[PDB]
Structures are given as C-alpha cells and as structure tokens.
Amino acid sequence: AVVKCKPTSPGRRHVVKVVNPELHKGKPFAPLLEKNSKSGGRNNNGRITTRHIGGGHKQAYRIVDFKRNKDGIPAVVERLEYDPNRSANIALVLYKDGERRYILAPKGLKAGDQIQSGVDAAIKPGNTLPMRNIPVGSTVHNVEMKPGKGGQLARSAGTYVQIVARDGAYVTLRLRSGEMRKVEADCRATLGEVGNAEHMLRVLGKAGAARWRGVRPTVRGTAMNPVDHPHGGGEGRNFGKHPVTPWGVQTKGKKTRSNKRTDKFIVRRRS
Amino acid sequence: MKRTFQPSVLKRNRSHGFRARMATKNGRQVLARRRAKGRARLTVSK
Amino acid sequence: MIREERLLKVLRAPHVSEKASTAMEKSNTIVLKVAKDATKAEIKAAVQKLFEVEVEVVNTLVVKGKVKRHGQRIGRRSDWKKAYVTLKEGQNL
RNA sequence: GCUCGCCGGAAGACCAAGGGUUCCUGUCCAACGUUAAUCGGGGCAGGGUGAGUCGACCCCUAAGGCGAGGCCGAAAGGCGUAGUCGAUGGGAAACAGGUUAAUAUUCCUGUACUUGGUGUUACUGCGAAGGGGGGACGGAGAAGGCUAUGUUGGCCGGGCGACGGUUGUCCCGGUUUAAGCGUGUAGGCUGGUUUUCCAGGCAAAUCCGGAAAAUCAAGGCUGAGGCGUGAUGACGAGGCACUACGGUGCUGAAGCAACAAAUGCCCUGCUUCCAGGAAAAGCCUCUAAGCAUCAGGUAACAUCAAAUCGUACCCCAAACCGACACAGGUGGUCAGGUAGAGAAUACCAAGGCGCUUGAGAGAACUCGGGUGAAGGAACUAGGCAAAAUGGUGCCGUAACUUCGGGAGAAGGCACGCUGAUAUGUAGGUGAGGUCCCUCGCGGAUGGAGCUGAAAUCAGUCGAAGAUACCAGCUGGCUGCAACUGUUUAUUAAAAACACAGCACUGUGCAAACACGAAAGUGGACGUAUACGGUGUGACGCCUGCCCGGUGCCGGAAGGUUAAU
RNA sequence: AGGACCGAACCGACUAAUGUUGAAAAAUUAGCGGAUGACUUGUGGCUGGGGGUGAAAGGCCAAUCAAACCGGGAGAUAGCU
Ligand SMILES: [Mg+2]
Ligand SMILES: [Mg+2]
Ligand SMILES: [Mg+2]
Ligand SMILES: [Mg+2]
Ligand SMILES: [Mg+2]
Ligand SMILES: [Mg+2]
Ligand SMILES: [Mg+2]
Ligand SMILES: [Mg+2]
Ligand SMILES: [Mg+2]
Ligand SMILES: [Mg+2]
Ligand SMILES: [Mg+2]
Ligand SMILES: [Mg+2]
Ligand SMILES: [Mg+2]
Ligand SMILES: [Mg+2]
Ligand SMILES: [Mg+2]
Ligand SMILES: [Mg+2]
Ligand SMILES: [Mg+2]
Ligand SMILES: [Mg+2]
Ligand SMILES: [Mg+2]
Ligand SMILES: [Mg+2]
Ligand SMILES: [Mg+2]
Ligand SMILES: [Mg+2]
Ligand SMILES: [Mg+2]
Ligand SMILES: [Mg+2]
Ligand SMILES: [Mg+2]
Ligand SMILES: [Mg+2]
Ligand SMILES: [Mg+2]
Ligand SMILES: [Mg+2]
Ligand SMILES: [Mg+2]
Ligand SMILES: [Mg+2]
Ligand SMILES: [Mg+2]
Ligand SMILES: [Mg+2]
Ligand SMILES: [Mg+2]
Ligand SMILES: [Mg+2]
Ligand SMILES: [Mg+2]
Ligand SMILES: [Mg+2]
Ligand SMILES: [Mg+2]
Ligand SMILES: [Mg+2]
Ligand SMILES: [Mg+2]
Ligand SMILES: [Mg+2]
Numbered sequence A: 001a002v003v004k005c006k007p008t009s010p011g012r013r014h015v016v017k018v019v020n021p022e023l024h025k026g027k028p029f030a031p032l033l034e035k036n037s038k039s040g041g042r043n044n045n046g047r048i049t050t051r052h053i054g055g056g057h058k059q060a061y062r063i064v065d066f067k068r069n070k071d072g073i074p075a076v077v078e079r080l081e082y083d084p085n086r087s088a089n090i091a092l093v094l095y096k097d098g099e100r101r102y103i104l105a106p107k108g109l110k111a112g113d114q115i116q117s118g119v120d121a122a123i124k125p126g127n128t129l130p131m132r133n134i135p136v137g138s139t140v141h142n143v144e145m146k147p148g149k150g151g152q153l154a155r156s157a158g159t160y161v162q163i164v165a166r167d168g169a170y171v172t173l174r175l176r177s178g179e180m181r182k183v184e185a186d187c188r189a190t191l192g193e194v195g196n197a198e199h200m201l202r203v204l205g206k207a208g209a210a211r212w213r214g215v216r217p218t219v220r221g222t223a224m225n226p227v228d229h230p231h232g233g234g235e236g237r238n239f240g241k242h243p244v245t246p247w248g249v250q251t252k253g254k255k256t257r258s259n260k261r262t263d264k265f266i267v268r269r270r271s
Numbered sequence B: 001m002k003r004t005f006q007p008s009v010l011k012r013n014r015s016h017g018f019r020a021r022m023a024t025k026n027g028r029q030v031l032a033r034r035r036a037k038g039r040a041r042l043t044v045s046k
Numbered sequence C: 001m002i003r004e005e006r007l008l009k010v011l012r013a014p015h016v017s018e019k020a021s022t023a024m025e026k027s028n029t030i031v032l033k034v035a036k037d038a039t040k041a042e043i044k045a046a047v048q049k050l051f052e053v054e055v056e057v058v059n060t061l062v063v064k065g066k067v068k069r070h071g072q073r074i075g076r077r078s079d080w081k082k083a084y085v086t087l088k089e090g091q092n093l
Numbered sequence D: 001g002c003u004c005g006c007c008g009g010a011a012g013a014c015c016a017a018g019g020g021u022u023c024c025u026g027u028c029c030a031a032c033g034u035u036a037a038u039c040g041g042g043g044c045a046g047g048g049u050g051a052g053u054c055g056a057c058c059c060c061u062a063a064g065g066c067g068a069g070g071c072c073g074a075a076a077g078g079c080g081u082a083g084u085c086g087a088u089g090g091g092a093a094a095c096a097g098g099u100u101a102a103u104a105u106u107c108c109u110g111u112a113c114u115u116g117g118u119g120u121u122a123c124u125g126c127g128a129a130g131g132g133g134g135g136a137c138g139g140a141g142a143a144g145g146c147u148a149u150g151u152u153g154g155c156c157g158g159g160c161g162a163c164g165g166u167u168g169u170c171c172c173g174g175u176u177u178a179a180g181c182g183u184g185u186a187g188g189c190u191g192g193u194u195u196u197c198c199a200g201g202c203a204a205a206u207c208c209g210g211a212a213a214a215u216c217a218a219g220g221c222u223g224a225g226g227c228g229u230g231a232u233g234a235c236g237a238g239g240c241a242c243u244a245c246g247g248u249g250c251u252g253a254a255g256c257a258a259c260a261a262a263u264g265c266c267c268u269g270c271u272u273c274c275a276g277g278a279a280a281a282g283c284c285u286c287u288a289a290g291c292a293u294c295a296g297g298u299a300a301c302a303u304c305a306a307a308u309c310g311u312a313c314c315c316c317a318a319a320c321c322g323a324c325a326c327a328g329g330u331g332g333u334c335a336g337g338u339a340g341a342g343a344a345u346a347c348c349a350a351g352g353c354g355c356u357u358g359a360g361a362g363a364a365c366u367c368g369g370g371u372g373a374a375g376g377a378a379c380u381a382g383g384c385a386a387a388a389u390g391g392u393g394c395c396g397u398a399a400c401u402u403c404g405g406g407a408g409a410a411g412g413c414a415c416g417c418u419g420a421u422a423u424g425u426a427g428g429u430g431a432g433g434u435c436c437c438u439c440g441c442g443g444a445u446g447g448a449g450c451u452g453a454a455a456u457c458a459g460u461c462g463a464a465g466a467u468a469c470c471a472g473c474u475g476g477c478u479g480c481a482a483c484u485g486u487u488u489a490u491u492a493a494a495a496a497c498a499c500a501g502c503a504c505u506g507u508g509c510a511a512a513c514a515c516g517a518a519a520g521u522g523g524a525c526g527u528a529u530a531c532g533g534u535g536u537g538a539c540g541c542c543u544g545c546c547c548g549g550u551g552c553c554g555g556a557a558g559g560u561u562a563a564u
Numbered sequence E: 001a002g003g004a005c006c007g008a009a010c011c012g013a014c015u016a017a018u019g020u021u022g023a024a025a026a027a028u029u030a031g032c033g034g035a036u037g038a039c040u041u042g043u044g045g046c047u048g049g050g051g052g053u054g055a056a057a058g059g060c061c062a063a064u065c066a067a068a069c070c071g072g073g074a075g076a077u078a079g080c081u
C-alpha cells in the first residue's frame, strides 16, 4: 500500500512509503543467507570504477533460486519476505521433500499457494517450465537466456515478458525495454509477473533516503574545473560544449551497443 | 592541533618494517642501498 | 627429565637485596638470577638437584637492562631473568 | 605544621595507544630547570615489575594481504584457486582481605574455579577434512522488576563546647564484607511426548528438515535480583603501648531497617519501524570410511600439568603527538553531597593542586573587567562591539500557510518565607496482624512505619522572591536558495556544492560504462520498476518560436576517396 | 514518528577583541551552528602522482599541491642579475 507521510518535518513532507503488511516481520531463513560486503564501487585495483556507490545499510545476501530446476516436486509458499538485495520480494517455499528455497515472488502469490517446475507443471503463476511447453502469448518472468543457466530477464519488481511467437528452436519475447528478442525455446520461464509493482511509486523524499541505499552524491560536470571534467570551467554558469561523459564520449543520443555476437538474436531494438 | 605523526607500532612495522621491505624487489633494493651506505639501522624494525 | 648439564647452566647467582632478604625470612623464598632462557620447570629442577631442597613453586620475571652513559656514550645493560623460588616449609637454604 | 585560595563529568581515579626506567631509595647541584634551589621527570649509584584464572601468545574468522598449481603479461611483474595469514570482533577459569620505599585479581591469608594429560574402577558404539544445530548480531521506543549508590532513622562509640544558649526532637564518627557454592524468584521464549514413514541436507545418519498418526496438556529452555552459605572469619570508630616521633605493634563496639534510585543489570529481552541489520571456530548433535568383547566414549575417584612473553612508571599529560617542563591535540572506563530537568551551572566531598622568577609602586598608554548625570544610534560602510531579552505554570497570540506550521508569535498574570487546610495532603512505598494456601522468593486482606508533590486560604520581610551562577531580544518589508546537509585544513560558509523531485539519453546482460598492454575486477551475485551518463533542482502554475550552424540519430540516387 | 524542537558531552567554525619576534607556523576569550544523523569516534584495511580522492574549493594526498616527496639525468638551460 502506498502511503503519503504527513509534513511534520521538511524531510517528511514528500515521503511516499510502500508498506506491504504481508511481508514476514521476523528474521530471514538462516540456511539461505550469506554475507555480501560492500564495494564502494571499487574494483580489485582499489580504484572507483562506478561512481556514486558507498555506505548505506548492511545487507545479508539471500540465495534466491533462479534455476527452478527441482522438477516434479510440489512446493508450498511458506511466507513472503523483504529482500534488501533487489526490488522484488521473495517467497520462502517448502518442497514436499522438506527442502526450502527462496524464489522471486510473482504477483498474486501468497502463503499457502502451491508451485511446481518442469515440463509437466500446470500453467499457473509461480510455475516454471521450458518455454516450449508454455503457450505463446503467456506473460512470464525470470526468463533464462541459455538453457540451464538460470533466469536473467524480467526479475525486477513488477516486470514480465510476453512470449509473442515460436519458430522452431526459438521463441520471441517482448522485453520490458520494448526490445523484441529471440531466445531458445528450451530456456525456462516462470509464469506471471514479478510482484511488488508498487516499488516504482515510492518517493524517497529526502537526501538521506538515497544515502541509506548506498548512493553517494552526483556532482554535475558543469560544477567542476576543466581539469576534472570536459564540462568544467567558465566565469559564471557557462557550457558551450556537446554534453559528454567524464571520459569525453557524447552522452545525449550516441549509441554505445557494440556486440556483433548477439545481434542475430535481436529481432527489433527498443526504439 | 592534531599533527601529522600519530604513532602506531603495528602500522610502523607493516608499512616500513623489515618484512615489508623484503616482500618486493623495490623493497629489497631499499635494503641493498642502506647496506651499501652502511646504515647501522636497516629498517624501523630496529 | 632435564639433563644435568642443562641444570648446571640455568642458575647464575643468588640475588641480594632487601626485597630478597624479606622474601627469605617472610615467605621462605630464595631469589635467584637465572639464565634468560630458563623455564620455571628447569629452575625448579636445578634448585632441587643442586641445592638439595624441596621447591613449592617458581615465579619468574625478566628484568630489562638499564640504559647508561659512560663518557657521553650511550650503552645498555643486559636484560636478565629473576626467579623467586618458594621452598616448602622446613627447607633451609 | 597551621591558615588561605583553586579544580572536583576534574585540574580526581584507572587504562588503551605512545613513550621506555621517567618508578623507589641514597647521594650530588657543574650543565639542564626561562630566577634561587638544600628541590627535580637533571647527574651518579643501588633497588624495583612475581600470574593455570589479567593481557599477549594460542584456537577462530572480517575488511584486506600473501598465494602451490593456474590464467595473463617485452622483462620486472599483474590477478587469482587450493590454501595461508590478518582484530578493531567470537572462543575455558578468581575473588575478598592483608602486605613493599617501590608489584600485586601475580606475593601472603582465607575461600574458589577452568581445561587438559595419565591412571584406577564401573558402564558403554566410538569414529570426520563431511551433515545439522548453535554461536549469530539493526535503529528507535516503552515500561516493569532490580541493583550500584545515596538519604534518613535505629544501633554503637565519642562529645557537653574559647562568645549568649546547647542532657537534647542536640553534636561528631562509624554502621563494611567478594567470588564461589546452594536456592530458583520478577521477567522472557516455547506446546510436550511417543510412534510410523519420506523425491531434501553431494554419501550416510538414530541428527536436522518434511509428512501422518496417537496421546497428554503443562513440560522444557532462559533469567536479573533477593535469600542462604562463604563468614565462630575478614574489616572495623576508637582506645591502649612503643616511636628509630616519620610510623609501627596490640585490641576492637555497633555492624540494622526504611525510603529514594540510575544512563548499570534482567534486556542478545519486549513493542515497533524500514534503510532489513558479520564471519568462522569453541560448543552440541549426526553419521561415513574405519575400528571391533580393541581402540574410543561416558561417569566417578586419584594424581599430574597449565609453558612462554607483558606486568615498574606517565597516560587529557612536564613522561604521548606538537623543536620547549609549549594556554593546542589525544580513544576507553569510573560518576559522591546540596541546589537543579540535567553529565548544564554554583558551592563542596574523596582526591588533587596554587600553574618554577619574585619584591615594590599605584603615571601616560595598552589589555581584561565594573559603574555612569542628561541624551539614546546623533556613532559607523554597517548598531561592529556593548547593553538588553532570558525560567516555570496559567492566560493570550496576527498576516500568511504546503494545514504540519507560522508560535516560545506578540503580550499579560503569578512566583520568597511562615501557618493552616493536612501535628505531612493527593500520590508512592509497604511492616506487623488476619485469613487462604498447587505450602512458597505464594495469594488476599490489612494498613503501622517511611517518603511526598501540587494547590488554596491566611499571614509576613525586602527596593527587588525565575533574586546568585544559569537563562530566547522582539516585530515589519524585501533579494537569493525549497528544506536538514556540504565546502576553499590556515583571510571566502555563501546566492556556491549536494539534495529529494523532473527530464533527456545510453544500456538485453559476457549490459552500457570504468580500472586494466592482458588475465581479470567493479557495474552486480543486480537484469530495464535495473544500471550508467548528462542537465535541471522541493512544491505550485508552467516550459513558447527556430533543425540553417555544430553535434547526435537515420538514410543512400550521385560526386570524391585508402591499403590493395 | 522525525536528515523534528531547546540544550551539555561530542562534532564544528559565523562575529568580535586579543595575539601577529605568539602561550600557539592558525590559537585564546566572549558570544555562535549541528547535536538520532546525509551524525560522530577508536582500531585495522584499500586507492599513488598526469595518478588517487573530491556533496567540486583546483579542495586534499604527512606544516609541501594548476601535478607530492626522495634520489638520479644534473654542473638542465639562463642572449638575464
Ligand atoms: Mg550515478
Ligand atoms: Mg540526480
Ligand atoms: Mg568552481
Ligand atoms: Mg579538457
Ligand atoms: Mg555569464
Ligand atoms: Mg554564449
Ligand atoms: Mg603462585
Ligand atoms: Mg610472568
Ligand atoms: Mg571552588
Ligand atoms: Mg635516566
Ligand atoms: Mg620521583
Ligand atoms: Mg649556587
Ligand atoms: Mg639555575
Ligand atoms: Mg632522576
Ligand atoms: Mg605461481
Ligand atoms: Mg594474489
Ligand atoms: Mg583470504
Ligand atoms: Mg588463522
Ligand atoms: Mg581483539
Ligand atoms: Mg605504584
Ligand atoms: Mg540497595
Ligand atoms: Mg544515553
Ligand atoms: Mg601499574
Ligand atoms: Mg612551567
Ligand atoms: Mg601541555
Ligand atoms: Mg576528546
Ligand atoms: Mg561543570
Ligand atoms: Mg591600573
Ligand atoms: Mg579599561
Ligand atoms: Mg556595564
Ligand atoms: Mg549614561
Ligand atoms: Mg540614566
Ligand atoms: Mg528610548
Ligand atoms: Mg547615521
Ligand atoms: Mg556621521
Ligand atoms: Mg552584535
Ligand atoms: Mg552582553
Ligand atoms: Mg506555601
Ligand atoms: Mg534589490
Ligand atoms: Mg540553502
């Protein structure tokens, strides 16, 4: 539920919270937890390689099952959980054999719902099948790009993919980007949309709220000296250049895709 | 006012001690030079 | 079992002081200068063999040598080890 | 030595870091010490640091480091797997009293505890490089229950007062005791037990997870404190006796209760929120290969062991970082009284100090302060500086507003002490007694005693009762930036930067992009509700015209045009 | 509840005076801002010089910064003093 905060202080006036009362209030399932310590956007040379990453809250990594390989064995949804590592919620599912796993929580999935994977699975949300066994027209998510590799497409809160055509070895997918893309029909997909579609409606409301998420400030190129950025310099606010990245590449329309290897599988670019 | 030298023996030995010098070829050259000069103390270790 | 050769090296001297004297009279404890690498086991073994007494317990400490000047020239005395050796009641040394 | 003054959330006490003998004693006063120095952190000599339990080492891991093979790279090297290191974190166990010139949870006294080795005896499925449990975790808030601790009373010892009074509802002091062991309470969590079965936990598993029965519903885990014991002990005001007059030796009363009470403990709890909150070992448990009436396990008892290194001293500082015995800097712990909301502030206690030149004098001028006739911003670039306001309760409070605010708007009234209400109230606490009682650290009742606001009425002193210290000046118009933040360490704190929000744009995942001859790594264990870049900068109303130039995107008839 | 309010510790540095061969190569005194957070602090770690890091001041990178420091090329060169 999307709830506007009352303006009892300047930092609250514009806050809009997304409050889901279904989410488990307790601690997560400890056998499926790992540490993921933070990078500060620094690589193994110790250099910043992505700017604007630092701090924020500590977060345990939940091992989420993107492969959905455990075919034939039904699973019941025990609870939905908050996952700090991603926009989607996750669902703790219990298999009949007593194995527990986390899956991306589809829209509509609730505690008590059954799910199953494999060719024989029913066409209902949460069920994972090879896309050759999914009816053309189906909305799916957590789609594999290579058979066996695990879901890579449509994992973010509220996302999904339509299977729009099948032709031999390949299905064609409409991605959220709008790209039409071919993928092997043996690639698995989970039925339905990723849940937590309200995710996008949150309004952080204050500087600090972005800092909690580990986002450090962006200094505009034009606020700098020439030595620091192509945009830097000027007495007063000047500009008088084509906008570029800090490394001098044009940043307003110039295309940067360069992958001849995967061009064959793009039917139509997002445009 | 806080001045630049804030001593820590652990940091001293890690940054400049004998074993740090021995760990790299450039560090070993430091030791070679200081032996050639005939320093009484090769490193901060002693 | 420590060898008799080793035992013959570990005790270096009795240590003479007011504190050592009070230790002997008050608490039946002899204070020795011992070899710097001597353990409590060796000091006990050595005192029992060489002085023919019964030792209750050994306490030890390392005394750090004093820095000194001998005509504007810095030197340093050696670290040495001191053993407070408590004898059993009745034993005399 | 007696007075005086200063600090007392420190200028006291204990540490870590850092230093390294500065510690104690004797001796010396050249140099050092901003003066003298008989003194010293100075010279010289001697002494002094005692551990199974404190800490390190050690076992365990974090960030990160190194890294057999490996992958990559003109060489040097880079990265990284298995590993192996790496605390600032996890992991066994000791307390009180006494003692030295100088150490003490280390010595001594008393009383404990931990882990491990051997052996003996009894009983017995043991076994890991593997599985599972546990260890194991956030912010905020709220209360209960406690204790540390304090206050008063009682008790004991002492006192009867340099000047009016002081045998009392009077004065001073003391009234302390640990770990451990026993007990299991306020509180917190959780249904329990047995049976059968099973696509999971790489194999196996009796363990964990799952399923289905049956039966029982109180069983377990956890837990401050209290009580008991420890303790017929220790300590103890003081007295008495020596003094080598600094101090030693001897003996020893009371040793209770009530009330208040933490920021400490119960509490790694509970409630709640979103930003969703280490790891690994010790520990517990399960089996595998293996071992078989053996090894090994469990228990009891005995015995042995628990090494090594640190331990002095300073430590908000004359001992560390600042060239100095330097108005500087430096993390943790301890937290008495009166007043007070308080760790503010004032005065004090314990304790510690008077800051290593003094003595006079009482000019100008400078510094730091106090007061000021009449006037009251006339000063000045500018009310700069100063003066002023300043508490609590109650009343009262405009435009405007995003409905929160604005607001402590503005402004007004009260305020001490005494008595009464009421020999101390409302409230809090709660003894005895009485009854019940799964008979206890229980329940009910009961109110003694203790503590104790706030108000009203009456009176009363002063110029003045928020009396000191402490402690908002207020209002009106307007530019800029929405806001809290950030910044030129050392002349700029701002209107600059950032910011939530907005938009454009790139990016289909071996993503774009970035670091990098490369391997790789970050982006991300993310996947278009995502990520990067750019500009704008809350919110409200909005965001027009121009695609020639220069970019970017797309096209392809023709011109021109490289290597070859 | 809160980048909420008043206010110590703690973090800072707006104004003034002093000081300027200082007590101090940036402080003191009186006032001042933040004070549950985009907070602050201890210990350890990582980023390296056309490089880092930068809520961006050309700021900071050991009292040094429009290219650190140390050594070397090196007795650079100096139509200048
Ligand atoms: Mg960014
Ligand atoms: Mg932005
Ligand atoms: Mg600028
Ligand atoms: Mg440029
Ligand atoms: Mg201009
Ligand atoms: Mg122009
Ligand atoms: Mg002993
Ligand atoms: Mg020792
Ligand atoms: Mg005083
Ligand atoms: Mg000396
Ligand atoms: Mg001394
Ligand atoms: Mg003289
Ligand atoms: Mg002199
Ligand atoms: Mg001396
Ligand atoms: Mg190699
Ligand atoms: Mg490596
Ligand atoms: Mg490692
Ligand atoms: Mg290790
Ligand atoms: Mg540690
Ligand atoms: Mg001492
Ligand atoms: Mg008490
Ligand atoms: Mg507090
Ligand atoms: Mg000490
Ligand atoms: Mg002085
Ligand atoms: Mg000083
Ligand atoms: Mg401090
Ligand atoms: Mg004070
Ligand atoms: Mg005068
Ligand atoms: Mg004057
Ligand atoms: Mg005045
Ligand atoms: Mg006047
Ligand atoms: Mg007047
Ligand atoms: Mg007037
Ligand atoms: Mg005027
Ligand atoms: Mg004038
Ligand atoms: Mg002023
Ligand atoms: Mg004033
Ligand atoms: Mg009254
Ligand atoms: Mg104007
Ligand atoms: Mg502003």
Ligand SMILES: [Mg+2]
Binding pocket: D488
């Ligand atoms: Mg400045």
Ligand SMILES: [Mg+2]
Binding pocket: none
């Ligand atoms: Mg300034």
Ligand SMILES: [Mg+2]
Binding pocket: D510
């Ligand atoms: Mg990738």
Ligand SMILES: [Mg+2]
Binding pocket: none
């Ligand atoms: Mg702007």
Ligand SMILES: [Mg+2]
Binding pocket: none
């Ligand atoms: Mg605030």
Ligand SMILES: [Mg+2]
Binding pocket: none
């Ligand atoms: Mg600053």
Ligand SMILES: [Mg+2]
Binding pocket: none
């Ligand atoms: Mg100040």
Ligand SMILES: [Mg+2]
Binding pocket: none
């Ligand atoms: Mg404020």
Ligand SMILES: [Mg+2]
Binding pocket: E007, E035
């Ligand atoms: Mg404040």
Ligand SMILES: [Mg+2]
Binding pocket: none
């Ligand atoms: Mg500039």
Ligand SMILES: [Mg+2]
Binding pocket: none
């Ligand atoms: Mg500098």
Ligand SMILES: [Mg+2]
Binding pocket: E067
């Ligand atoms: Mg240059």
Ligand SMILES: [Mg+2]
Binding pocket: E073
């Ligand atoms: Mg040359």
Ligand SMILES: [Mg+2]
Binding pocket: E075
């Ligand atoms: Mg020259």
